[PDB]
Amino acid sequence: MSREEVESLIQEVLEVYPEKARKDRNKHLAVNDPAVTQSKKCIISNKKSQPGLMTIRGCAYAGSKGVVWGPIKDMIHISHGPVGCGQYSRAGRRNYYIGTTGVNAFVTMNFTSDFQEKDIVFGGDKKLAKLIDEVETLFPLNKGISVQSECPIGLIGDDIESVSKVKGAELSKTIVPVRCEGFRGVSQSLGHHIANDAVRDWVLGKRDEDTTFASTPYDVAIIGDYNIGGDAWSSRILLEEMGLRCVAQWSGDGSISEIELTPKVKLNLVHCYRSMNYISRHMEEKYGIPWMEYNFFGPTKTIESLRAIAAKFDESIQKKCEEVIAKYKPEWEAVVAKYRPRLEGKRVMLYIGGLRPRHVIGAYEDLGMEVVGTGYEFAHNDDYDRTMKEMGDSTLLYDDVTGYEFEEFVKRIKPDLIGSGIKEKFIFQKMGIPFREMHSWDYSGPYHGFDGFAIFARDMDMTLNNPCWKKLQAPWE
Amino acid sequence: MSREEVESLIQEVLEVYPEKARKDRNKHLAVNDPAVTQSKKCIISNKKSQPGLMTIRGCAYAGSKGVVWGPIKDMIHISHGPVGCGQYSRAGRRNYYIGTTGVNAFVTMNFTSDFQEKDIVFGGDKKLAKLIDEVETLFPLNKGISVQSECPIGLIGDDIESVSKVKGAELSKTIVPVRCEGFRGVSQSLGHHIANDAVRDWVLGKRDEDTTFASTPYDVAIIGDYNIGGDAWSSRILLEEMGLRCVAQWSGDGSISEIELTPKVKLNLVHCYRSMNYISRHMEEKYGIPWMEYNFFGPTKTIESLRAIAAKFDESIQKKCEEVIAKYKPEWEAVVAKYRPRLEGKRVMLYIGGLRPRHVIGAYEDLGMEVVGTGYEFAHNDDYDRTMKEMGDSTLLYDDVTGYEFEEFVKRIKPDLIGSGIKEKFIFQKMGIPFREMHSWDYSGPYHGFDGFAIFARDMDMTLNNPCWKKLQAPWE
Amino acid sequence: SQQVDKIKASYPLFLDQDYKDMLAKKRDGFEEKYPQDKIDEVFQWTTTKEYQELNFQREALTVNPAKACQPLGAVLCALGFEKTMPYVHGSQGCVAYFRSYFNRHFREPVSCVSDSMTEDAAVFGGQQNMKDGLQNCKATYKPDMIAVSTTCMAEVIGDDLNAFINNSKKEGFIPDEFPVPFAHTPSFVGSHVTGWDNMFEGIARYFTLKSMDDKVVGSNKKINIVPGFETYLGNFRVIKRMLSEMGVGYSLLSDPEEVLDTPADGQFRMYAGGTTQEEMKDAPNALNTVLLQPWHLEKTKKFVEGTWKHEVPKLNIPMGLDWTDEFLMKVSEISGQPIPASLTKERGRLVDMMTDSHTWLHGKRFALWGDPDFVMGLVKFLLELGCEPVHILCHNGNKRWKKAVDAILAASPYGKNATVYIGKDLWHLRSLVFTDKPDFMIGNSYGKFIQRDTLHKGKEFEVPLIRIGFPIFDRHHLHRSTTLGYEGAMQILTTLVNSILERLDEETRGMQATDYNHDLVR
Amino acid sequence: SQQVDKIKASYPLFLDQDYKDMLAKKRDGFEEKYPQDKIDEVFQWTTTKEYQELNFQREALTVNPAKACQPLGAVLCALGFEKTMPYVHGSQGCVAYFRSYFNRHFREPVSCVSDSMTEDAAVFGGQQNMKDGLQNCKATYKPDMIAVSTTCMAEVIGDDLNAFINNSKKEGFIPDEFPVPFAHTPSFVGSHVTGWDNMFEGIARYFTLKSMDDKVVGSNKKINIVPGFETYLGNFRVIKRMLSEMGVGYSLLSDPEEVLDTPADGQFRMYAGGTTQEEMKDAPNALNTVLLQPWHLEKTKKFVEGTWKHEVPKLNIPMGLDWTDEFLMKVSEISGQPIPASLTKERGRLVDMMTDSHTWLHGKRFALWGDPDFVMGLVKFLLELGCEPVHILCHNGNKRWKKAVDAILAASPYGKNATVYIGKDLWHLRSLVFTDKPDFMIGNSYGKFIQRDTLHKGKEFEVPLIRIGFPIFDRHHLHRSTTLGYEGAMQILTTLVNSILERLDEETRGMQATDYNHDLVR
Ligand code: ICS
Ligand code: CLF
Numbered sequence A, B: 001m002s003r004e005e006v007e008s009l010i011q012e013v014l015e016v017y018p019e020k021a022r023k024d025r026n027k028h029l030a031v032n033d034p035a036v037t038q039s040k041k042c043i044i045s046n047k048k049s050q051p052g053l054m055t056i057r058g059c060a061y062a063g064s065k066g067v068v069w070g071p072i073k074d075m076i077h078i079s080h081g082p083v084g085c086g087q088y089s090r091a092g093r094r095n096y097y098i099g100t101t102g103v104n105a106f107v108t109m110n111f112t113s114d115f116q117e118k119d120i121v122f123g124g125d126k127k128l129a130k131l132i133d134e135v136e137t138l139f140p141l142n143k144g145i146s147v148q149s150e151c152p153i154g155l156i157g158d159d160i161e162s163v164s165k166v167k168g169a170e171l172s173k174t175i176v177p178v179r180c181e182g183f184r185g186v187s188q189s190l191g192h193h194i195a196n197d198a199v200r201d202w203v204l205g206k207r208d209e210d211t212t213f214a215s216t217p218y219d220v221a222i223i224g225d226y227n228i229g230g231d232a233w234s235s236r237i238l239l240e241e242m243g244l245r246c247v248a249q250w251s252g253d254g255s256i257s258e259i260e261l262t263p264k265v266k267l268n269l270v271h272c273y274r275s276m277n278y279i280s281r282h283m284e285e286k287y288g289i290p291w292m293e294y295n296f297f298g299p300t301k302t303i304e305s306l307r308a309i310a311a312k313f314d315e316s317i318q319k320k321c322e323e324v325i326a327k328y329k330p331e332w333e334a335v336v337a338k339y340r341p342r343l344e345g346k347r348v349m350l351y352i353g354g355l356r357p358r359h360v361i362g363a364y365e366d367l368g369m370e371v372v373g374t375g376y377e378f379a380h381n382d383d384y385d386r387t388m389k390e391m392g393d394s395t396l397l398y399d400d401v402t403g404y405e406f407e408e409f410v411k412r413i414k415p416d417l418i419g420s421g422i423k424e425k426f427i428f429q430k431m432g433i434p435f436r437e438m439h440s441w442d443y444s445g446p447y448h449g450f451d452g453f454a455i456f457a458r459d460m461d462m463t464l465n466n467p468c469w470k471k472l473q474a475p476w477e
Numbered sequence C, D: 001s002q003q004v005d006k007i008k009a010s011y012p013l014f015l016d017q018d019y020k021d022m023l024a025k026k027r028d029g030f031e032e033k034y035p036q037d038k039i040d041e042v043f044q045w046t047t048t049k050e051y052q053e054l055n056f057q058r059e060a061l062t063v064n065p066a067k068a069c070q071p072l073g074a075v076l077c078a079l080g081f082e083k084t085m086p087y088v089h090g091s092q093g094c095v096a097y098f099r100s101y102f103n104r105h106f107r108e109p110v111s112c113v114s115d116s117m118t119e120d121a122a123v124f125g126g127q128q129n130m131k132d133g134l135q136n137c138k139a140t141y142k143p144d145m146i147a148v149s150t151t152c153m154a155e156v157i158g159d160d161l162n163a164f165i166n167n168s169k170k171e172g173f174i175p176d177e178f179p180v181p182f183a184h185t186p187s188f189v190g191s192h193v194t195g196w197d198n199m200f201e202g203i204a205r206y207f208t209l210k211s212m213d214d215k216v217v218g219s220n221k222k223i224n225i226v227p228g229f230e231t232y233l234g235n236f237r238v239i240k241r242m243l244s245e246m247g248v249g250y251s252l253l254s255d256p257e258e259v260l261d262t263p264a265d266g267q268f269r270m271y272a273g274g275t276t277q278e279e280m281k282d283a284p285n286a287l288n289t290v291l292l293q294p295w296h297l298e299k300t301k302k303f304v305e306g307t308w309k310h311e312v313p314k315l316n317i318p319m320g321l322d323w324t325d326e327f328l329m330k331v332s333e334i335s336g337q338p339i340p341a342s343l344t345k346e347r348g349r350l351v352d353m354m355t356d357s358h359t360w361l362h363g364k365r366f367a368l369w370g371d372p373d374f375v376m377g378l379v380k381f382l383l384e385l386g387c388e389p390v391h392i393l394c395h396n397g398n399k400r401w402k403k404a405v406d407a408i409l410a411a412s413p414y415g416k417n418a419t420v421y422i423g424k425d426l427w428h429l430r431s432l433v434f435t436d437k438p439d440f441m442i443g444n445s446y447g448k449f450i451q452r453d454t455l456h457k458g459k460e461f462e463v464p465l466i467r468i469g470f471p472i473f474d475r476h477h478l479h480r481s482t483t484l485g486y487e488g489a490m491q492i493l494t495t496l497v498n499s500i501l502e503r504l505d506e507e508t509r510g511m512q513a514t515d516y517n518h519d520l521v522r
């Protein structure tokens, strides 16, 4: 097991830091014990980052604008404040959608108020109203406006709630103010929370008195799937092959009407617990809609998820589920037969912000790949509670890891493959270790579902067995 | 104008050569006197080039395969011999055509027999027959085969006439043997002659007994226009705006059926005298078809040629000619108004092949441009008889000029613009003097006709007034 | 469904019939999408002149800007010094965005740290964050210098960098001798190049303001070179090579070329190369100082002239023919070193390529954008080519720069149909290229969307994109290119002429329809 | 009709309605054209596998070859020596074609002369032509050496070069001491690279065969470098730069880079640079000799080993990672000079770009053609990238070369679907890319027609062309590129990955149809 070897490594890595930073970082590093179901006794999470240790975390604006609200294709999202924010967040996340960009869809565009000195000194409410009027003028077929605040909005005392109410009443338009200033919280998680609260307050209940939608006993809502490279699509087809009818899709390729129609479904299938559990619990409390978590990463987890979902309905849906399973069995079996021999026994280290570091494990194991260490940027203790049962004994756990810590961990453990973001990719490629981006899928995908499993297997094989990795040492040294 | 200086320059340039080469080259250099009508008293032409003086002339294969036979789109032309010839001549000349390349058109392709040692040692008639069978197999929709001989064909004892006869009788196909070996003659002109002889011997008389083609009193044949950059097309429209009907055009965008239908026309409009006068005279002798020369370079020559051609017919054609003139007058007047002020008084030197040196001067004069010196690679004394009356007094004339001679002439005269081929272009661009290719037209055009005059004017303006020519001297030197 | 032998990624997997039926059912059932005819009508309306008139009346909304905020340029300037850590006082999301954005452009590791200020700092300020962050960064990553910029958070709350760093030093968090230069970089003022200028001026002031007594101008026989905000390694390389060929002593201040081009040989080098502290300390002893991009180096120019007493030459960016000539003549005059024959030969070769490609380059119409110095250099070069720029747009440009560009335009007959726009964004440019269609665009990757829109109007209305500028995300290794000097002019000419030829081949590839002009030789 | 403000060239002038009506009347009236349905049927048939089986049974006909004749390579080799005139004994049309063909490729002046043999020489020979031509050329163009090749005319008639030159010298037409090397270059044997080999072997034999007595191997502490037939200037530049960084003495024999890249400064330089006669006379004193392209330098290898007694290393062309490494290690061993840190850094940078672009480069299928050494280097490089060559075709290749390429393919799992073709032409390759469609082609300009044909089958069947090789006619200044060494590998990788990205952008530019995958960042 070498659990002591791992704890000793943790201590030696800890040695470098000053006393305060060392004492704080010691609580965020741990050795996995699958028998332990209470992660708080073993690891701490969802705390502030230590200054000057080069964290990977983002801000609340990234959690709200870049994650939850941005995928909504038929609405226009205004980055309220200086110009940098929406520019750096523009089209960086492969949240796929169908539409005519600039006419009915606005995902890949950067709307901003672009504050100057005068806006900072005198405020920006009048500029916000004028901007809303101009947005109405030049983009008539939009179906709603969201206003994502940046740091100065909260630092200068701007009241965009009143402006949103007045302009929405004037224009008969849905205008959603989101107080997602970057210095609230400690990461993108509070951005998720604020975005969900805004959705609850201004969007969810518009059609509460509307009964014209015809419903069926087979109505589900896909919550927390952002269609990364088409991921959500590859899920929906399977749900449609099982006999389900998907009203809405939160929030990749999503539309405002879908969100408004969501309170009419019979079941809420939540993929990302971390970013949407708040609204899932709210809808259970208010509308009585049950919600359950599922996993579509790899054939084993998706088979289990499909069976569990079909268990919530009548026997016809169960029969269709078995039919879908039998239909897709040979394809993923062929994928396994082709690629499992090429990846047997290799070891992977993961570091992704929430939920995915644990859901992608099953696919790796289906390819016979061992995940020897995993961690989150911004997960909570419930995420670690779900996590600790899915990793091997004496595997490495780590919350809000620093660049130095993670480099030392990789040097000591020496994994065959590393899956993390763009800020680690080239660092660990120059060290000679294959790297896969597990946020954007290295610009490939989708990975969800049976169709995504083939792409996942092909990508892992092509990167791990690449002939480049055997050529970093020049023949004269 | 400075007549004495011209022959002084001729003598000083002459000084460098050895005695034999000097005595030979002295007869090919002259001072133009427009009063002289017999050019043999001043200049000699159509002679062998002096060894080792870097001439510009081509070979008979270029004159036959590359000039006359190549533009025929629906026939396949086999470069019989080693591989170099057709490869260097493949798609080098912008003889435009309409067709499906590889299916019904074969202009831009290189068919060759590709001799090795064994074909030289034992001959190549059997391989020619096998090649013809393979051509029939893989290109079924061709309408005839031509066999263009290269130097070894005539050097070794091949007899492709008998092979052509046997294979044509066997396959019911028109197969034309052309003895255009590069060592025959002194230039491309004998290639023109051999190609025309082959055309009369094997193609022209197919439909002599056929009377099914319905003819009109307005039937003309465009002879000696090879559709360089679309030139022939820009002529044809004008002839069809005058009420004429063009059965065939030789040979750009030409077809074998059009050549066979040529003996049925009422008039032969010859554009290139030098390459097609042989077949024009043969048609006048055998079929009684009159032929006349015309010039479609520049509005003035185009108007004169159209009026003469209409004068060859009845009053309705003349009235349509006047209508065409009135229709096109404002366009070329606008061209002159826009471009003449920016090219007034500039001086040009031309060195081209057999027709264009004298035949584009009128277009330059329409722009107020003076041609101070002109010359031919391979022209005859009759071409110079036309040239002298076309050119001005005390302007330089020169036949089969060498690179040294022409460089010295350009250094002394110092023209504003130079028009010649690809083998002079970069030499005179590095000298700091604007250069226009006069064969492929710098891969622009067409220049024939009213529509071509605008392109000609634009190209001359863009090259001569280019800001690059004021930057060759470094500011520190 | 997937075939194991030929696996499809999202394209063209989602073009399958089952996925198409799924998407159609979803759209018709629950998206409440506008009818296609209305969508087409609105798009056609957005391609019109009336929509352009409405678009240029904008005062409050910005759509698709072409500029970044100051701390990005501050970080880029900071990375150009030896073993120096960029330290941004403020919120960590800004650092995450800066790191990701530079990673996507350069495809290399980029190191920067934050002090992670939160609502508690939003109430009481960030002294404690500054102290802890400086101590932690120094203890962990062991850099020789920490260069401090700011986010908009600390700028709004008015955090005092000087006092914070002093209090950190006097309380023992960091050593007193340890170099910590600082600069305020407010994101609501200027743009990223302004942040670069502020960061460099701060570093220069930190290293030489208090030690001018023993400095003698010209006593080290070198030339200080300040490049500015530069995202092409080839520009640093070509300037260094050109200075070395002349045998001219030089100091290249803020040289990041090594740290952004490290080898992948089995180890990670967080630091590599850069300008030394000794070089910065000795800079006031140079003969003079050259700013490669004067239009965003104004504060640095004021500091260098007012304190170092260097007579800064009035030079444009060395882009193209004439301005490279002027730059090299100024270098020869200041250093007394004659221009060598190799540079003469290179200039002649560039002239040769110009006269070779002039026929294809003449009269082509271009819309372009970027940073002011790069924009004006490209405009000057396009004039030198016989080309006609028509829409010249600089989102971060100013009025004096616009007059300079107009004066450059008036000096050439080819700028008669050109208009300069300052403060406009890429949506304005989309309207401009719809209503007055040019031949090509020159700009960064964000222009690709515009091309898409034009292709939606029709193939005959499509305006091809040419990727020169920053950032370039959808192509690989273009950051290795060069735009400065004769070498940069040569590469720019090759790119332009071959793009024109590629478009001509595309338009002429149709058999028996347009393939008559599909020439072998061009 | 033409509008004076917007003048149209042939494209799109001939797309006007009146011109289309004219062409329709012409075709329907007098061309007797086959019906469009028959044409479509025959084209579809030519895209099939049965047509491919018929096409590969060819024995007598060659369609669209990918090779030239020997005197072209002889002229290219001759131009690499100082103040040397290429003199081609035979017919003048050959020289006209050679000059125009090199002019179109290099876009530079190319100087060569003929003796203009005519029908008279067909029965008497060319003694008189040889004497007069040598005298005239020497008196007129003032060269230091005349390098004599032959056309197929003189080869068939059996003109004796040595006797002709000797009789020219003894009768006073040219001075006795004046260097006139010669070589027989039959166009019906081999190809242009064979002519290069023959010309170089002739020159070497002329300068060193009769003075071996005082020659000591290795006494000048240099390395002879023989490049072979090379049409990229950057290869000469990169080899010299790499040798110079190593601090290794070298002699580059037949170096034409200067004469093909003269500056445009107001004068015409017929000669520039080149290998001196002293260098050729002193070459046998070198430590050894390296052939950059051994597979068309066999006669030169036989002469150098047999006479100079140099132990010529068994080296592949320095293309790509492993072969560049082997070349540099062999140079370090022969000269005793260690490999410097700059070269290590450059190799690391190339490795870094490989790992950055591997995901997009993996599994792509390529057809490719060219000269044997270039083809095998490209195939090795593509195997190093994770790419899959499928159709490897060399018209001028031989059986031993085929066996070596097969051995190279067998060493890599990515060559499992690769087939090597010798003696085949571009029509065979058109059939191959129709019946087994690859992703891209790598070849010269002649491939563009093939692309056209594929586009006529459909957009989904179109195979994009990538222009690497000789000749390159429809693009400008690509002859300045480099394919050798780490720099060559870097440019080749950039070109391939960006071509793939450009194709992906073209495929995903459709609004609301495929633009869901039109990603900003790739
Ligand atoms: S045929 Fe002749 S050399 Fe009359 S061989 Fe040559 S397409 Fe010239 S001056 Mo090239 S007698 Fe045509 C010609 Fe003139 S190839 Fe063209 S331009 S009008
Ligand atoms: S934590 Fe988050 S990303 Fe940071 S600012 Fe705050 S909301 Fe925004 Fe936009 S403008 Fe630039 S990047 Fe910042 S410093 Fe002022």
Ligand code: CLF
Pocket: B059, B060, B061, B062, B082, B083, B084, B085, B086, B149, B150, B151, B180, B181, B182, B183, D069, D070, D071, D091, D092, D093, D094, D095, D097, D150, D151, D152, D153, D187, D188
């Ligand atoms: S004058 Fe003319 S072009 Fe010359 S050969 Fe003769 S027909 Fe031909 Fe083809 S193959 Fe090569 S280029 Fe010659 S040398 Fe043997």
Ligand SMILES: [Fe+3]
Pocket: A426, C106, C107, C108, D352, D353, D356
């Ligand atoms: Fe990199």
Ligand SMILES: [Fe+3]
Pocket: B426, C352, C353, C356, D106, D107, D108
């Ligand atoms: Fe050139």
